[PDB]
């Protein structure tokens, strides 16, 4: 007997109610620009896989960011373009400005409106309590928007959050793993970086939704308020679930397994063992106590649930008491 089917609790049918062309990215017709409008200035430090550059638009002298889409399926390129076009102008969403190909190389590139190469990872272990709440709220605006637009990001992590801390501006970047949510669709579980992978990915439950992003956000929040990077520090994808099980406990894990009739990979049998659900107080110490409050712990607890259906939505998260002072100060200013 197969796994039990699942639906998103929110924004379940938004793509069904759209015209086919909104989400049918394989049939999207891209008018490919010319690279000659742009001059690359310097390579942005994004590690070994990346080809991201600061560039100049020659015509207007405006600074842009260029991402060279190194060889991968045509299908993945049209998916990222269509998602960026659909989300263009959304709150805290990076703005796609142009789509170009090398005249000779024929390699496709995305041009984005300029942001400083200063990610949340470089800032997010040195912020005040108020600033963690502020930036988390800004990330939730981007996630509620993309979820409301029928899209899951699937790669929420500090490296994909660009922050201009002087202007208190944030952008959610790298939509290369993002997908359209369709009720009943079984998705690839080989998404997200190890430390941010939701339990659904680790146990191979394919009928996941927007709630995957809310697990990743919880992992980010835990690492920031406890100053523990990453929070769930697995050796590999198998040990990753063990690190979660040692915190969330094994009772709720096996109840989740039972509820969705998930066939657990046999490897897990020897390694998961039996663990109590730990009180969050265990992670609190003298160097992180100024970031931890009852409000923060209540909010974190409601994000980090095995059962994806149980997790706060982005909109429910934005209504949590943890953000009351952020919401007040936003209206006031
Ligand atoms: Br936009 C762009 C994209 C790729 C490029 N490679 N050489 N110069 C390039 C420019 Br300008
Ligand atoms: Br900055 C920036 C802006 C948009 C991006 N999309 N993928 N990677 C990106 C980077 Br790095
Ligand atoms: Na405290």
Polypeptide structure, described:
GO terms for molecular function: ATP binding; Hsp90 protein binding; identical protein binding; kinase activity; protein serine kinase activity; protein serine/threonine kinase activity. This protein has 333 residues and is an alpha+beta fold. The chain folds into 2 domains: 6-23 and 115-333, no CATH class; 24-114, no CATH class. The chain contains 11 helices and 10 strands. The protein has helices spanning 20-23, 74-87, 129-148, 199-202, 211-226, 237-248, 250-259, 268-271, 294-303, 314-318, 324-332, and strands at residues 33-34, 38-43, 52-57, 62-68, 96-101, 108-113, 151-152, 161-164, 169-172, 179-180. A 6-stranded mixed sheet has the order 1-5-6-4-3-2, with helices on one face. α3 runs antiparallel to α5 and α5 runs antiparallel to α9 (294-303). The longest helix is centred in the middle third of the chain and has 20 residues, at 129-148. It binds 6,7-bis(bromanyl)-1~{H}-benzotriazole (2 copies) and sodium ion (NA). Residues 35, 38-40, 55, 66, 68, 100, 102, 109 line the site of one 6,7-bis(bromanyl)-1~{H}-benzotriazole.
Backbone shape? globular
The description of the largest β-sheet is:
6 strands, mixed
Strand count: 10
Structural class: alpha+beta
Helix content: 25-40%
Say which molecules are bound, naming each kind only once: 6,7-bis(bromanyl)-1~{H}-benzotriazole, sodium ion
Q: What is the string of SSEs from the N terminus onward?
A: HEEEEHEEHEEEEHHHHHHHH
PDB class: transferase
Keywords: CK2, casein kinase 2, inhibitor, bromo-benzotriazole, halogen bond, transferase-transferase inhibitor complex, transferase
Assembly: monomeric
Entry title: human CK2 kinase alpha subunit in complex with the ATP-competitive inhibitor 4,5-dibromobenzotriazole
């Amino acid at each position: 007997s197969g796994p039990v089917p699942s639906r998103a609790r929110v924004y379940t049918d938004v793509n069904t109610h759209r015209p086919r062309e909104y989400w049918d990215y394989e049939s999207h017709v891209v008018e490919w620009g010319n690279q000659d409008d742009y001059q690359l200035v310097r390579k942005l430090g994004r590690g070994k896989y990346s080809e991201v550059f600061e560039a100049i638009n020659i015509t207007n002298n405006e600074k842009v960011v260029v991402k060279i889409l190194k060889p991968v399926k045509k299908k993945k390129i049209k998916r990222e373009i269509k998602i960026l076009e659909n989300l263009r102008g959304g709150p805290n969403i990076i703005t796609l400005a142009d789509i170009v190909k090398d005249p000779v190389s024929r390699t496709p590139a995305l041009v984005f409106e300029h942001v400083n190469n200063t990610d949340f990872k470089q800032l997010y272990q040195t912020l005040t309590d108020y600033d963690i709440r502020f930036y988390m709220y800004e990330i939730l605006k981007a996630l509620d928007y993309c979820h409301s637009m029928g899209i899951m990001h699937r790669d929420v992590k500090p490296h994909n959050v660009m922050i201009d801390h002087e202007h208190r501006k944030l952008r959610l970047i790298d939509w290369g793993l993002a997908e359209f949510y369709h009720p009943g669709q079984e998705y690839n579980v080989r998404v997200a970086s190890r430390y941010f992978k939701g339990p659904e990915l680790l146990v191979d439950y394919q009928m996941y939704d927007y709630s995957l992003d809310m697990w990743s956000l919880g992992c980010m929040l835990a690492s920031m308020i406890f100053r523990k990077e990453p929070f769930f520090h697995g050796h590999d994808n198998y040990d990753q679930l063990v690190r979660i099980a040692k915190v969330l406990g094994t009772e709720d894990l096996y109840d989740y397994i039972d509820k969705y009739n998930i066939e657990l990979d046999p490897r897990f049998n020897d390694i998961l063992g039996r663990h109590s659900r730990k009180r969050w107080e265990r992670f609190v110490h003298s160097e992180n106590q100024h970031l931890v409050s009852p409000e923060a712990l209540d909010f974190l607890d409601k994000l980090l649930r095995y059962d994806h259906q149980s997790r706060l939505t982005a909109r429910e998260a934005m209504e949590h008491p943890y953000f009351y002072t952020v919401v007040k100060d936003q209206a006031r200013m």
